[PDB]
Symmetry: none
C-alpha cells in the first residue's frame, strides 16, 4: 500500500523564476501529524500560478504551483479527524484553523496559516516534496500540479462524493473568489449597478455573483473584446473597453449611469485599474472591491480625496469565504444545479499539456483550463 | 425691523490666505427664495477653518469662515417652510436637499448641494456678503464668524429651543463628525478595539462614539501628551505617542492587542497618519476611517498589499450623518443627557477674541474654543 | 441588433382583476407602421394603475399597466418622423393625432385615440405583447411596467436629452394633470380661494398649479393627516380632514372662507367627494373640477340645485394639456427649474419591488414611488 | 293722491296649488323703508309661473305670482334714492343688493336676497298684500299679476322712459334669461355649433343669443313641431324632434354635426333632458348650460363619466345678469334695435284674460303672452 510509504509520482516542477515547466519525477513524503496526502483528480490553471512564473508573485524555488483542484484522500496523518482515506476533497490555499482571531471573527477569513509571504512550507515549517535529492516547495498551502500533494488538515475541505472533479475544482479558487467577491465582500444589493474590470475567469464569476444578488445593471470592462460574448451571456447587461473613449473610464461610467455606480470590482491585477475602479464607484456611497492580486513590491499612488468623500475601498481573499465552512456548501449548491461552472471551463486537457494551458491563458483564448489526471 | 432689509454688522473677514482675521463692518443682504438669515449666537473654532488661513484648503478671497454654530432665524426668505423667525437653528455645512441620489440613498449623505469645490456661494451661485464695496465669499454653505449669515433652507436644521447654543454648536461639525464617524460611518461593534489617531475636538468625539458603541478598548494616539488626560476622561482605555517607540506604530498596536485592532480613525489630516491608520487595523477584518481632511493637491502613496488582505478603508463627511434628520436628534440626545459636550469646550471667549481662539488651537492648548456674540 | 426583431424581456402582468402582479417573461413585437418601440428607464406608480387591480377601472386581461414613464427609443416603425432611435421620450397615454376635433380645438385635448373604454390595443386594433403564447393587452396607449413597449407615434413626446428619467416621468401623468388642472382647466385666477380634495401625487400637483396661478388661499383636504406637512410645503395655507367636524365639509369650507370658495378640485376618485367638492365651491360663481377618476359603472346621484344656482362643473383629463405640444415644453421648463418634481417623489425603488411600491401607496406612506429599470 | 295710503286694487290670486287663478280685490300696503310701490303696465306669462300652479315649484299660499313685467313707480318708501314716482322700471325677481359676495364678484349674479327658498316675502320678512283679511304672499321678490306691487329698492331697475312696456317686460325674465344664457353664461363662441333644447319663450331667446354670438349652427329641439317655424325665424339653422329617430338624441346630434356640438342649453325643465343635453355636447370640449328649472325635491342620477372626459356643465339664473346693471342696458340695446322682441310675443291680452294666456302656453299655441293693464 502507499500509506506510510513515500509516493513516487510525476509533478510539474519549476526550478527557477521565469523558466518553463519541467515535468519531473518526485517523491512525496507521507503525512505527518494532522496532515493529509491527496491524490489530485483535476486542477485548473488560475492566473495566480502564472504570476509565480512571471515573478510578480513571491515564491521560493523550486516550487510545485497549482492550488485550484479536487482530489481523493490517499492517506490521513496522525490525529486527523475531519477526513478518512477515500474521501473526495478540495485543497484549501486559504485555510481555516478555527482558532485564530480572523477565524473566530465572522467578518474575517484570512486564517493565520495563510501563506501570504511566500513561506512555501507546511505548518511545521518543512516541505513534503523531494526531487533529485533537493526539496521542492509548496504553493499557497497546496501545490496541485502534481499527482499527489500533502496539505495541513486546516487546508482540507471534505466535499460530496458525486461532485465532478473537473468542474467543482473551480470552487478551490476562481469561482468562489469572484462569486464571493460580490455576495460576501461587497455584498451587492438588489437593483444595484455594478462594474467589473477584467472579464477573465474570476471576472466572469463576479458577474455571476452580482446577478445572483439582484443587481439590475452589470457593466463588464475588458480590453479583449472577445471576452464580451461570454460576459454578456453571464450577466453583463453591457460591456465596454477603456480604449473606446479618450476620456477617463470613470467619467464614461458616470455618464452611462448618471453618476450612480454603487459597485466596482478590480479583477485584473493592475494598480492602474485599481485606481480606475475606485474612481468609478460613486464618490460617497460607492464601494470598490479589489479582487486582483497586485504585483509584488509595487506602491500605489492615488488621490486621497477620492476616498475622503465617502467611498469604501476593500480587498478580497477567496471571495470572503471561510474555506472549511463555505466550500463544502458551495459544492452542494452546484449539485443542486444552482450555478453553472461549465461556462467557465474553456479547455479540459491531460496534465502533460500543462505547457499548452499556460500558452492559452496567456493569449486570452481561454477562461479556465482544467488539467485532468 | 430688519426683515427685508440689508443688515450691517461685524464679521471676521479673511482678505487673503496666510493673513490674520480682520473684523470688518459688512453688509448681509436679505434672504432670497428659500434662504434663511440667521443671527449667530455661538460658533466653534474648527481645524478646517485654520486650513483656510494656512492655505491648505481651497477657497476664494475675501471670505468669511466658521461653519460650526448655533443661531436664531432672523428672517426667512420666500418659500421657506421648515423654519420661522425666532427659531433655534444650526446652519449646516453638509446640506440635505432630500432629493438627490446621496440624499435619497440610505447609505449616502454628501448632498449634491455640498460646496466640495470651494465655490463660496449659495445654491443660486451668488454671495450675500459685501464689505468695502466688495463681495465676500461664503464658506461651506455657512460662514459663522459673523453676526448674521444667510444659508439655503437645505442647510438649516431646526433644533430644540432649550438648547444651550454655546454647547450644541459643536453639533454643527466637531462632535457630530467624530461621534458619527464611529457609530455611523464605521459601525463600531461592541466589545471590539479601536484606535484613534488625533485627540483634538473631533478625535475626542470619536472616542465618545466608540464608547457609545460599546468598544472594550479605545486607544488614543497623539504626539501631544497633554491631550491624554482629556482623552481618558472621555472614554479612552489608554493613550500613547508614536515617539514612545522606534518600531512602527502598527506593530506596537498589533502587539498591544494580540493582533486585534478592529477599527482605526485618522482624525488629524496627514497622509502619513492616514497610511499609519490603515496599516494599524487588522489586515483582514479591520476597518480604517479617514476623518481628517487631506491637504489640497497631495497624492497618497501606500502599499496596495495593505488593502488586498481584506482591510476596509472608507472616507467620512460630517460623521456620515444626513444633516437635517440627524442634527436635531443629536441635540435631542444632548438634552436627554446621553453625552456631555462640556468636556470638549476648553474655552469660551467673546467673538472679538477670535485670534486668541486660533492661537490656542494652533498651540495645542485648547480642544474647542467657542466664540460668543 | 433588436430592430425588426421580437424582444424578450420581463414585464409586470396582471392576469385577472383583484390579483397581485406576476413578473413574467414576455415578447414585445417590433413596431409596425407609425409605431415606436421604447425601452423604459423609469415609471411612476399612479393610483389609476391600482384601480385596474381593484377592478374599478375597465380593462381587458391579461394586461400590462403603468403609464407615467420616461424612456429611450429602441426603434421606430415604418413611416415615423417625429422620433429616431436613441431619442429620449415620454410615452403619452393621451394621444395628440392633431387631426381630430378635440385636437383641432384649442380648448380640447381628448383625442379620438384616447382609450377611455378599456380597448387595450393600439390604433390598428392589435396587441404587441405575448406571454405564454397568449396576447397581453396594453393600457392607456402606453403600458410602462415592462422593459420594452410599443406606442403609436401619436402617443410619444420627444423630450430633451438632459431630462433625468426618474424625475420627468411625472410629466407623463401625475404632475401635468394636477398642475394643468389648476392652470389650464380651472384657469384659477389671482386672489382666488382654491380647495383641493386629496393630497396624494396629483392633489399636491394641483396645489402647485393653484399657487402658480395666484390663489391667495389654498386649502388642502385629506383623511390622512400625514399628508398635511407636504401639502403645506408645496403651497397649501391650511389643511383639514373631513373628520375634524360633524357639519358637512361644504359648511366648514363656507365658514372658513365666509362663503368665498372660488374653486374646488376633486383629486380622489369617489362619487361622494365629487359631490362634496361640488357643494363646496360658491353656489353661484364657484368652479368645481373633477380630476379623480370615477369608479367604472357607478352612477352619480346629486341635488340639481347645486348646479342650477350657477356652479360650473367640469371634468379634467391630463390637466387639459395637449400632449405632444405641452409635454416637451414642461420638460424644458423643468430643466429651467420652474417647478419642483422631487417634492412629489417620496420613494425611488427598483422595478422588481413593484408590489412594495403599491403597498406603500395603499398604506398611505408614499406620494409617488418611481420604479427604475 | 295714493302715496302713503293703502291701495285697493285687483290681482290674480292662487288660493292653493292645482287651482286656477281668482281675480280678487286686494289691499297693497304703502312702501316701507327702501321699498317701492309700482303700477304694473304689462306683465308676461313665464312657464315658471305655471310651475306654481302645477305644484312643481315651491310657494306658500295664497300667493300672487308673475315676475316678468314693466311698470311705473307710484310711490317710493323712506330712503329710496334710485327711483322716483313716475319713473319707468322693471321689477327684479333676481335682486342686486350690491353688497353680498355674488354682487361684488364680477362672475356672480345670484344676490343674497334672492328668494331661492320659496319665502314669498320682502327683505324685512313681511308681506304687503292683503285679500279677504288674510295676507297673500309675494312671488320671487316681485309679484306682478296685480295692478300694484311693492318690491325692495334692490329689486328695482330704472329703464329708459321711451321703452314699450308691453315688449320690454320680456327683459324681466324670459328674454334676458335665454339671451344671457348664450352670451354671458355659455359665452358661445363665433362659428360654433349650439343646440337648444326647448323652443319656448326662453329657448327662442337663447337662439337669439347664440345668433348674436355668431354661432354657425343652432339646432333647435322640441317635441312640438309647430314651434319650428318660429325657431327658424329667430335664428335656428334647423330643428328636429327627439321622436324623429329611435337612436339616442346625443348620437343623432353627433352624427348631424360630425361630433362637434360645442354648446347645449336645456330650456325645458326636465331632469331627463338636462342629461340628454349634457351627453349631447362634445364629451371633451362641450359646454351644457342648464336654464330650465328642475322640479323641486328631485334627485338627478347620471353617468359621471360624461363629466369626467372634460364637459363643462353649469347652471343659469337670469341668463347670468347682474339685474340692476344689466336690465337697463338690455332695454337700451333694445331701443338701439339690436334685437327684435316682437317675434317672442304671440299674444297680447288684457289682464282679465289671464286664464286664456295660461291655456295657450299649456297647449303649445303661444310663445310669450303679454297681459296688459
Ligand atoms: N484575491 C484572490 O483571492 C484571488 C483569487 C483568484 C484570483 N485572483 C487574482 O485575480 C486576477 C485575475 O484572475 P483570473 O484567473 O480571472 O485572470 P484572468 O487572466 O483570466 O483575467 C484577466 C482578465 O483581465 C483582462 N484584462 C487585463 N488587462 C486589462 C486591462 N488593462 N483592462 C481591462 N481588462 C484587462 C484580461 O483580458 C482578462 O480578461 C489575478 O490577479 C489573479 O491572481 C485573486
Ligand atoms: N470629515 C470631516 O467632516 C471633518 C469634520 C471636522 C473636522 N475635520 C478634520 O478633522 C481633523 C481634526 O480636526 P480637529 O478639529 O479635531 O483638529 P485639532 O487641531 O484639534 O486636532 C488635531 C490633533 O491631532 C494631533 N496631531 C497632529 N499631528 C499629529 C501626528 N502626526 N500624530 C498624532 N497626532 C497628531 C494634534 O496634537 C491635535 O491633538 C482635521 O483634518 C479637520 O480638518 C473633518
Ligand atoms: N384626470 C386624470 O387625468 C387623472 C390623472 C391622474 C390621476 N387621476 C386620478 O386622480 C385620483 C388621485 O390620483 P393620485 O395619483 O394623486 O392618488 P393618491 O392615492 O396618491 O391620492 C389619493 C389621496 O386622496 C386621499 N383620500 C382618499 N379618500 C379620501 C377621502 N375619503 N376624503 C378625503 N381624502 C381622501 C388619500 O388619502 C390620498 O391622500 C385618482 O382617481 C386617479 O385615478 C386622474
Ligand atoms: N333659469 C331661469 O333664470 C329661468 C328663467 C326663465 C325660465 N326658466 C325656466 O326655463 C324653462 C322653459 O321656460 P319657457 O318660459 O320658455 O317655457 P315654455 O313652455 O315656453 O317652453 C317649454 C318648451 O319645452 C318644450 N318641451 C317640453 N318637453 C319637451 C321635451 N321632452 N323635449 C323637447 N321639448 C319639450 C315645450 O314644447 C316648449 O316648447 C322652464 O323650466 C322655466 O321654469 C328659467
Ligand atoms: C378562462 As377565463 C375565467 O379567463 O375566461
Ligand atoms: C380575456 As381572458 C385571457 O381572461 O379569457
Ligand atoms: C374574459 As374574463 C371575465 O374570464 O377575464
Ligand atoms: C369628429 As372627431 C375625429 O373629433 O370625433
Ligand atoms: C332665418 As335663418 C338665420 O335660418 O337663415
Ligand atoms: Zn487562484
Ligand atoms: Zn485560522
Ligand atoms: Zn493589462
Ligand atoms: Zn469643521
Ligand atoms: Zn441632496
Ligand atoms: Zn468672487
Ligand atoms: Zn501633525
Ligand atoms: Zn485656558
Ligand atoms: Zn380571464
Ligand atoms: Zn395616472
Ligand atoms: Zn384579449
Ligand atoms: Zn386627435
Ligand atoms: Zn377615500
Ligand atoms: Zn427640491
Ligand atoms: Zn320667468
Ligand atoms: Zn347682493
Ligand atoms: Zn304666510
Ligand atoms: Zn316635457
Ligand atoms: Zn284658448
Amino acid at each position: 500500500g502507499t500509506a506510510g510509504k513515500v509516493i513516487k509520482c510525476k509533478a510539474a516542477v519549476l526550478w527557477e523564476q521565469k523558466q518553463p515547466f519541467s515535468i519531473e519525477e518526485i517523491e512525496v513524503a507521507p503525512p505527518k501529524t494532522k496532515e493529509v496526502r491527496i491524490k489530485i483528480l483535476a486542477t485548473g490553471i488560475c492566473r495566480t500560478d502564472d504570476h509565480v512564473i512571471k515573478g510578480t508573485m513571491v515564491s521560493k524555488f523550486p516550487v510545485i504551483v497549482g492550488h485550484e483542484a479536487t482530489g481523493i484522500v490517499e492517506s490521513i496523518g496522525e490525529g486527523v479527524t475531519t477526513v478518512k482515506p477515500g474521501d473526495k476533497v478540495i485543497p484549501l490555499f486559504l485555510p481555516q484553523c478555527r482558532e485564530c482571531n480572523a477565524c473566530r471573527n465572522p467578518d474575517g477569513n484570512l486564517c493565520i496559516r495563510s501563506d501570504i509571504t511566500g513561506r512555501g512550507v507546511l505548518a511545521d515549517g518543512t516541505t513534503r516534496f523531494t526531487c533529485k535529492g533537493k526539496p521542492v516547495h509548496h504553493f499557497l498551502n497546496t501545490s496541485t500540479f502534481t499527482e499527489y500533494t500533502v496539505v495541513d488538515e486546516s487546508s482540507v475541505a471534505k466535499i460530496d462524493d458525486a461532485a465532478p472533479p473537473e468542474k467543482v475544482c473551480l470552487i478551490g479558487c476562481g469561482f468562489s473568489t469572484g462569486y464571493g467577491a460580490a455576495v460576501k465582500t461587497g455584498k451587492v444589493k438588489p437593483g444595484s449597478t455594478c462594474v467589473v474590470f477584467g472579464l477573465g475567469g474570476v471576472g466572469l464569476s463576479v458577474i455571476m455573483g452580482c446577478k445572483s444578488a439582484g443587481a439590475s445593471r452589470i457593466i463588464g470592462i475588458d480590453l479583449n473584446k472577445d471576452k464580451f460574448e461570454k460576459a454578456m451571456a453571464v450577466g453583463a447587461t453591457e460591456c465596454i473597453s477603456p480604449k473606446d473613449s479618450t476620456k477617463p473610464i470613470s467619467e464614461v461610467l458616470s455618464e452611462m449611469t448618471g453618476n450612480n455606480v454603487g459597485y466596482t470590482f478590480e479583477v485584473i491585477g493592475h494598480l492602474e485599474t485599481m485606481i480606475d475602479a475606485l474612481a468609478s464607484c460613486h464618490m460617497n456611497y460607492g464601494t470598490s472591491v479589489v479582487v486582483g492580486v497586485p504585483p509584488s513590491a509595487k506602491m500605489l499612488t492615488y488621490d486621497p480625496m477620492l476616498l475622503f468623500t465617502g467611498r469604501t475601498w476593500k480587498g478580497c481573499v477567496f471571495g470572503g469565504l471561510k474555506s472549511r465552512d463555505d466550500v463544502p456548501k458551495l459544492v452542494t449548491e452546484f449539485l443542486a444545479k444552482k450555478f453553472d461552472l461549465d461556462q467557465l471551463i474553456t479547455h479540459v486537457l491531460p496534465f502533460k499539456k500543462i505547457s499548452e494551458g499556460f500558452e492559452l491563458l496567456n493569449s486570452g483564448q481561454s477562461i479556465r483550463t482544467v488539467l485532468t489526471f
